[PDB]
Design a protein around this nucleic acid. Sequence first.
DNA 1: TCACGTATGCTATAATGTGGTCTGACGCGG
DNA 2: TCCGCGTCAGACTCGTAATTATAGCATACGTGAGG
RNA 3: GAGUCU
Lengths: 277, 49, 50, 1362, 79, 99, 49
Amino acid sequence: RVLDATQLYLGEIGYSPLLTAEEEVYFARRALRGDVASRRRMIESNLRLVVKIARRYGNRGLALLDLIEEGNLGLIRAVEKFDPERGFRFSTYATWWIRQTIERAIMNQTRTIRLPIHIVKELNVYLRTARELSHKLDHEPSAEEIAEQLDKPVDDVSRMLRLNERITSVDTPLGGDSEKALLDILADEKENGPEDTTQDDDMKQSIVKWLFELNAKQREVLARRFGLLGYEAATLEDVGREIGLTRERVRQIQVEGLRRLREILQTQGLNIEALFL
Amino acid sequence: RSPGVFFDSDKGKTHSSGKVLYNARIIPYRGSWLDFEFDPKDNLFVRID
Amino acid sequence: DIVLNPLGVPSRMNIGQILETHLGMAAKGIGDKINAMLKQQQEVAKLREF
Amino acid sequence: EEFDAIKIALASPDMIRSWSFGEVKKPETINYRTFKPERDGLFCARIFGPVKDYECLCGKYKRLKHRGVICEKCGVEVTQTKVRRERMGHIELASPTAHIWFLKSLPSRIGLLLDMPLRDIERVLYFESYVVIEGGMTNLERQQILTEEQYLDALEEFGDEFDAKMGAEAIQALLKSMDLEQECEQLREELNETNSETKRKKLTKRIKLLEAFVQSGNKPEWMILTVLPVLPPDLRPLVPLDGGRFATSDLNDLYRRVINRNNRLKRLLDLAAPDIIVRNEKRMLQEAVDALLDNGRRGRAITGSNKRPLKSLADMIKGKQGRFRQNLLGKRVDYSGRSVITVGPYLRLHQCGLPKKMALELFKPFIYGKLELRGLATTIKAAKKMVEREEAVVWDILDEVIREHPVLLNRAPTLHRLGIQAFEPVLIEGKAIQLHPLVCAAYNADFDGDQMAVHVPLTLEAQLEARALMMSTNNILSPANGEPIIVPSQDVVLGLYYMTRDCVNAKGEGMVLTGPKEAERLYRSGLASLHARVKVRITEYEKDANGELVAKTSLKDTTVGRAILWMIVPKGLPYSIVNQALGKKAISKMLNTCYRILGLKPTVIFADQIMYTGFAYAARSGASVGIDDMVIPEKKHEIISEAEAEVAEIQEQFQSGLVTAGERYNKVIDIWAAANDRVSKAMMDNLQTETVINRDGQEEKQVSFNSIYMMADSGARGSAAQIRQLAGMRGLMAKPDGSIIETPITANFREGLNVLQYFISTHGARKGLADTALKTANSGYLTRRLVDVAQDLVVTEDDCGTHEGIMMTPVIEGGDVKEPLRDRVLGRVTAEDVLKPGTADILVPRNTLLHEQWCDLLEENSVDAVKVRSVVSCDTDFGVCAHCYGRDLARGHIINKGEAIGVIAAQSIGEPGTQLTMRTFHIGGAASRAAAESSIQVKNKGSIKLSNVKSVVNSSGKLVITSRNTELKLIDEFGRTKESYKVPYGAVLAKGDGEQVAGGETVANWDPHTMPVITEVSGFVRFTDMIDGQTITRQTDELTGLSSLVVLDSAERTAGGKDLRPALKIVDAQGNDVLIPGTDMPAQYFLPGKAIVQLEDGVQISSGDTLARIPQESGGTKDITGGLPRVADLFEARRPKEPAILAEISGIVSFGKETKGKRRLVITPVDGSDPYEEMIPKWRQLNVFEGERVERGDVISDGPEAPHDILRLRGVHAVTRYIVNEVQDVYRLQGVKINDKHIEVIVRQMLRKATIVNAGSSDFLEGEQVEYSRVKIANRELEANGKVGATYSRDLLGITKASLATESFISAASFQETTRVLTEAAVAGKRDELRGLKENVIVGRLIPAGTGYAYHQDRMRRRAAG
Amino acid sequence: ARVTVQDAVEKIGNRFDLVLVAARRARQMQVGGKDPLVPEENDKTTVIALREIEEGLINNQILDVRERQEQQEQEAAEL
Amino acid sequence: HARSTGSYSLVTQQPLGGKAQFGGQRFGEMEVWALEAYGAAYTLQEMLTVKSDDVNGRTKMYKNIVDGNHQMEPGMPESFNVLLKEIRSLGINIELEDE
Amino acid sequence: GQNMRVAFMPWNGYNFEDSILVSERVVQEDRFTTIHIQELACVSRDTKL
DNA sequence: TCACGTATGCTATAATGTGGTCTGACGCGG
DNA sequence: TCCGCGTCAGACTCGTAATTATAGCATACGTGAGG
RNA sequence: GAGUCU
Ligand SMILES: [Mg+2]
Ligand SMILES: [Mg+2]
Ligand SMILES: [Zn+2]
Ligand SMILES: [Zn+2]
C-alpha cells in the first residue's frame, strides 16, 4: 500500500497504453467525430506527458499536483481541437497546450491580490530585460536602467515593479521560536479608541447644547444647512426649500450664527487654542 | 558534530530490560547517513537516513 | 563617591571586589603621594626614587 | 447579551448555510489598482459587508440617511463595518470531504462509531479500495473492503446486487445507512454471553456513544462535510503595511487552495473527464480542507513562502498561543505601565513611590474629569492640551485625584497572590518606582534592576477591593503558612542585632538609668556603648484575663541599646522580648507575637518602626567587609595533610585490589566530607569565641564582633555554609550529573582557587545556572496543573454538619520532633470531643476553633494525637464548608464564605517548588550531602520499643534485624514517644526489645554503603541457577586465589538465563534443605542485580551471617530538582513499578497452588465464605507467613504503596495521609512550609469521581463513573423516598485527568488537549453552564466567588423564583 | 480606614460583604450626592464609606432601612 | 513606560504590546490567579473587559471616569466573539443557550 | 567605565538589596554621563492618491 | 458604436511514472 | 511490545524587513460616453 | 534571532 495522493495517481497513470502514430489518428478520427471510448483512452494514455511538463514548471507558484490538474485540462482541449487529417503528431500539438494552460493559470492563482494577464506579461518583459542588463552592469538593473533600455516611462517601469513586491503574512513571527508576529504590533485604525471615541461624543454633545444657545432662527438656518440637525446637508441657495426661501437673508443669518458662536469659543477658552486642532 | 564514524549506545533508554544497544553512524559532509544498530535479541540492523 | 552594601558580598561569594577595592585604594594612595610631590615640586631625583 | 449557558454540537449542512450571508465562489481578494472587495471573492463586500461605516462600494448610498438599504448597483448593504467580523460565508463543495477532527482525533469517532479501522477508512478516502455500503445479497459483507481487482469480480458476477463505492461519498453513505437504535440493542444483548474486560469496555463505550449520539441530536452524516463555512474577513484581514506592501492571514492562503480545487472539480465534473483525473482532484480537495481545518495532523503540513507551515483554524484555538491561553485566560490591559524599581526606606508599609509622568499618563480620564468640575477646561480636547503642556494647575489636580486612590503593583513571576499588592501612591521626582523594603520578600524583588507592573483600579468597587483585600498592610501573614511574610532582612536585622547584643564593660558598665530615654541620652551624649551591661528602670504592660492591660515596673539588667529598642515596642508585649540579642528568627517571632496579642494596626506600625531603627542603627554601626574579616584557622594545613593521607590509604589499597571502585568512591567522599566539617568547626570555633577581652576585673571572653560573623550569625545575609567557601574549605563540588566529584577543592575564596580548582568549580556553576533556566519550567508546570484542578473550589457553606476528620499524630521523625502536634492542628475545628487524659470531663468542644490559647492547653495536658475536621471529609456537595477548612492562615481568623481556596492551595504548593528551582542554583556552587547514617545514638534514657520488627539472634550474640521497615521509639517515664528513628535491614542492635538504655548510647549499628542479605537459618550454602556466564561472573587473584561472584541483572544478562532466578539456597550437613522455623519454606534468599558474593559454594554458615552485599550508590545531593518529580508523581497518582501487595478482605489466610514459582493466595474470610484469589510473583519474599488473621490493607509484600490500593482498602482518610505525608516529607527536606490543608484541598479534587457498582434508580446502572457530588444528591432522595439503592466506590484520579473529567468543557479545552475536548463535547452535545472561575474569566464576567460570591447567588435565586 | 480597614471588617464580618456595602455607600455620595455622616476631613468617597462602617453608622441592614425609607416615602406620595 | 488608552490589535481588539508600540501590560493567567485567590472579582473583571477587549466597555468607562462616576458598565470580550466564529468555521455549532 | 572611592557600610537602607547610593559629585562631574546618538528617518513615498 | 481594461484563444519537429532533514523526553493508550 | 500523540513557568527590551517566473499577439467580453 | 528579572 501507499497512502500518499501523489504516488497513487502516478501508479494509476503508469499502467496506461502508450499510443503509437496512426493509433493516435485512429482514435482521434472517432474522437472529433465524437466517441465515448476515444476521448478517454486518448486522454487516459497521454497523462504521462502532462506529468513531465508539469515537473519542470514547479517551485514557482503552485505545488505539483496542482500543475498536473491544470495540465490535464490543457490535454483535454488538445484532444477536442486535434486534426488527424494533418500529418503532424499529437505529442507535438499537445505540448503547446500543457505548457500554455499551466503558464496562463499560474499567473492568476500564484498571487494573493489577483494579478491580470497584461500586467504580468508586461512585467516579464521588464524581468528578462533585467537579467541581460545585469550581466553587463554587474549590480542589479535600476528601474531607470530598465525603462531607458526599452525607452518607456520610468513611472510605468516603477508601477509594474511595485506590483511584484510579495505579501508578508500576519502570522509570520519577528521573534523566532514563539515571540510576537505582525497582528501583535498592527493596530485597527478603523475602530477609534476610548479617548478618540469620547472626544467626538464631547465635541458633538458640546455642540448639541451650543445649538439651544444661539437665537431660534439662527440655529435653525445654520444647523439644517451643514446637516447637523436636519436630514440632508443643504447649501445657501437650498435652505430656501424649508421656510427661509431667501438667498441674501440666508447668507447673512448663517454667518450671523457663526460670528456669535466664534465669540462663544473665545470666552469658553478655545478659538486660537483649538485652531492648531 | 564532526563528520566521520562515531560509535554510540543507548544505555537503558532502549527497551525495558536495559540491554545496552550499541550503534554506529557514518556521517558525511554531504550525502545520506548510514546507521548500524543492535536489537534486544542481538541481531544487527541497517538504516539509511 | 559610592556607598555599597556589605551584605551584598558574603551571599554572592565574589570576594574579588573587595581585593580590587583594597588594591585600588593602595594604587590611589601612590597617585595621591605623587600628586602631592608634583604640587610640592620636590625633585626629579626624588620622584625617581619613590 | 446576558445568558445562562453555551452548547456545542456538529454543524448541519443546513446550519452552515444559516451563518453564511453569501457563497464565496472565487479565490480573488482585491483589485490591484482600485483596492476594493472583488465580485464574490474572499473579501467580498456584497457578502460580508462594506469597508467604511455605512458606505456601499460604488458610493451611491452614504451615511445614516440610508439606514437599512441594500445598494442595487454593487449589491452592498449600507451598514456598520462591524458586520465584516460577524457575518460568515460558505462554499458548496462539489464532493463530500471528511472532517479531520472526527477522523484523526483518536478515538476516531467516525471509525469507533462504524466499528471499522481508521486504516480501512483512509483507504476509501484516498481512493485505494472500495468499501461495501449495503451488500444486497449478504455474499458481500458490510464494511468489507474490496481492492480495485476485487471490485471488478463482483461487478461482472453480481452488478446491482451490491452497492460498494469509494471516496468520502462512500463513508458518508456508510454513516447514513447505519441505524443507531437497532445496532445499540444488538450490542447490549450480545455482551451477555462473553463479559470480559476489554470487550465490555469497548462495547460499553460504543453503547455510551450510540446513546449520546441520539440524545445530542447529532447525525453521523455530519462527520463528513458537504458544506464548508468561511471565516469573516476582519478576522483574517488583508491590511496595508505603511509603505505599499500588504499583509494577510494564513487562512486566506488556505481558503484559496480550497476554492481553486473546488471550482476546478466542478469544471472536471462538467467536462465528464475520466475518473483517474476526477479522483486526483477529490484527493486534493480532501487535502486542502484537511489543511484548512488542522494543518499538521493528517499529513505533512502545507508550507507557504517562509518554509514554516500555514497556520490553520485549529491552530488559533489550540494550546498556548491559542485564543484560550493567550487572549482570554489572560489579557493586555489599559491604565498600566512599569519601570525599574528602587528602595523607599522612608516610605510607610502602605505606600510606594509612583513617578510624576507615569501617574500623569495613568490617571488621564480622572484629571479631565476634575478639570471640568473645577471649571478650568471647557471640553475634553481642551483638557487634553492642558495636560499635554503639563501646566502648573494640572500637577495640583493630579495630586488631588491620587490621594486615597490606591494603585496595584505586580512582579514577574506571579507565583502566589502576594505577587500583587495595593499601595497608596506617593508622587516622586524621578522616573523609578520606589518599593517598601518589607514587602520585598513577597515579591522576591531585589533592587539589582527588577521591573514592576502598575495597574489603576478605576471603579469604586476596585478602589475598595484594593484597599480592603489587596492592600499591603492587610496582607502580612503568608496564606501558605500562618507566619508573617512581612519580616525585616539585610540591614534591618543587622541593626537590631548590633543594638541588642552586649559586650564586656564597654563605655559606662553597671550604671543605673531612669528609663529608656536616659539610655538614649547616654548613647547620643557619648557616654555609653549600646553594648554596656546596665540596670535600667522599664515599665512593661502585660495583658490581664480581661481586655485590660496591667502595668508593671521593674529594674532590668540589659544593655543601653536594648533599653532604647523598648521605645519601638508597643505596650502589650513583655520586655523579655527585647532583652535577648535579636536575630532574624527572633524578630519574626516579635511581629507574630504582636499580631496575635494586639492586632493589625499595632503590628503595621511596630513593623515600620523596627524597619526605621534597624536601618538607622545598621548605618551607625559602620559594619564592613575586609579581607582580614575572613579569618582562616591556623590548623587548616594540618587537617588537610591528615585527611590527604587517609584518602591516599584507600587508593593504595585499591591498587592492591583489596577495596573496589564503588566502595572507595563512597568511602573517600565520607573522609573528605568529615574533613570539610572539621575545618569548618575549627573555623567557626576560632571565629565565634575568638574575641578575648580584658574586663575591669581581669580577663574573659565573649562572642567575636568580626563583621562577617555578625552578618551570618544575625542571619542578615549568608550563613555558615557560605563562610566555609570564604575562609575555610570550599568542599566537594557536584558533577553536572549530580554525583559528587572525588577530588574536592581544599582552598577558599580568600586564599584563591588555582587554575584546576576553578575548572572543577565551573562544572557545578553551570549545572546550577542550567536548572535556573530549564528545570524551572517542570516546576511551574506543576503550579499550572494544580491550579486547573483546584480552580472551581470555593467556601460555599458555613457548617456541613459532618462529624468526620483525619487523626493527626505529631511528626516526630529522626531524634528531634520535626513538626509538633500544635503546629499541625492549629486553626482547625476539633472533629470529636477531645478531652484530657483522665476521660471524666470534656476539655474541648466539637465545633470550635483552635486558637494559640487552646493549643497551649493541648501541650499542658499532653494531648498526643487529635482527630481534626479536614477538607477531604467535608460532605458539602457544592464546595467546602468554613469549619472543615478552618482559619485563613493569611488572616489568622476563620475563613470567609466566598474565598477561593482551590487557587490559594495550588499556589502555596506550586510556588516553593518554582522559586527554589531558581534559588540554591544561582547561589549554589558546591555539593553538601552527608548521608553517612552509620549508627543511631539515643539521647534521653528510655526503654527500647521496636515496631514492625522481626529480628533473629546471630553467632556473635547480637540481635540482627531481618525486616525492612523497622522503627525505633524512645519511651519516657509515663509511656509516650519522644524520639523516633529508622533502623534499617541487617542492622545490629545493642539492646533488643524492651531493654532499658542510658542517654548517649549506640542502640543500633550498621554499614551504610551496602544492603546485606542476612539468613534466618544455619547450615551450608547451595548455588541454585548460578550458572557462570549466563546469570553471574567471576574474577580471581594469585598464589592462593580468592574469587568473588557478581550477579548480573536483565541489563548485563543474556537471553539464556532470563527465566533463571539466582538464589543462595540453605542446606544442612547431609545436603537437604533447612526449613525456616515454623513454616513450610525451604530456605532460599533471592539475590538481585549487581549483588557481590564473597562466600563461594559449600561454605558453613550460622543464622545472622551476610550471604551477599548489594551496592548502595546514591551520591546525589537532593535539591528541589530531585524530589519534585516525586511530588508530581504523587499528585498524579502513579502506581510505582513494584506495588506492594495488600489484603483486600479481613479473614483467615490459606496459601494455595503455584505456577512454576509464581504464588497463588486462595484466601477464605471467616464471614465472607466466598474466596478471593490473586497471583503473586516468584521473587517477592512475603512478610506474612500464611494461616493468620489478616485484616484489610495489611502489608503482604514489602515495598511502595499504590495510592489506589490505599483508598480501595483503607478508605479516604488513609490515602489523604499517604499523599500529605509523602509530599510534605519532600518539602520538609528543603525547609519549605506548606500547611497540610493545602495538600488536602487538591487531594479532595483527586477524590472527585466514583464508579457505580450496584444498579441505581436513574441511569447510572453499572460501570459509568460519575462525580461523588451527583450520586449523593440522588441518594438523599433515594434514602427517604425509596427504590433501588445505588452502591458505590470512590475512585482516585491524577491532577491532569481530574481537570479533564470536569463537566465544564470550557475548563477542559482551556487546560490542555484542546483538539480532543472540543470534539468529544461536540459529539455528546454537552452544555457548559459556566460554573467555575475559568469559565467566567473567559466570558469576561464577575467571578462566582470572592466579592462576586454575593452577586452570583443573587442571580441564582432569580432563576429559582419562577 | 485610612491605611487599615481591619476596624471596618470587625464591624460587618466578611471582607467581601464589606467591599459591597462600602461601594454601595460610595456610589450614593458619588452620584446621588448624599451628605456624609462623618466629617469629610478631605478624603475620597471610598474612605468616607469605610469611616461610616467603622463607627457603625452604615451597614447592609441599615442601608436597606434607609433605602426603604426614601423609596416608600415616594411610594406614599404616589398612593 | 505608561499607558492609559491607546491603539488596539486588529483581530483580538486587545491593547498593543511594548513601549516600542506604546502598549499596555500583559495580565497573564498567573496574574489572574492572584485576584481569583484574594476574591477581588471586580478588579479582575475590570482588567478582563473594559481595560482589554469590551469595545463598549472601554469607551463607556472612559466617559464614566471623566464624568467622575467610577461605574462598572461591562460587556463581553471581542476575543470570545472571535473564539465563537473560529470554532464555527471548524464546522462546530457553538451557540449561546440563554436564560 | 570609571573607578571611584567606594565605602562598604549600610546607610539607612538606601543600599538595601544591592541598591546603590552615589554622591551628587559623581553626577556633577558628568563622568557617568553617556552620549546616545539616535537615527530617525523621514520617507516621502507614493500613495494611490 | 468607440474606448478601454480584461479575458479567451491558439502555436502541428518530436516530446509520454516524482526527487527537501537527517537528534527529545517522559507518559499513556491501542 | 511498538507506534503515535500530548504535555513541557511568568512577564519585559531590542531588531530588522527576502525570492522567483510565467511567449506573444488576435479576436472575444463588459461598461461607459457621445452622436 | 541578542538580551533583562526571577
Ligand atoms: Mg534577592
Ligand atoms: Mg534581581
Ligand atoms: Zn453601491
Ligand atoms: Zn465540612
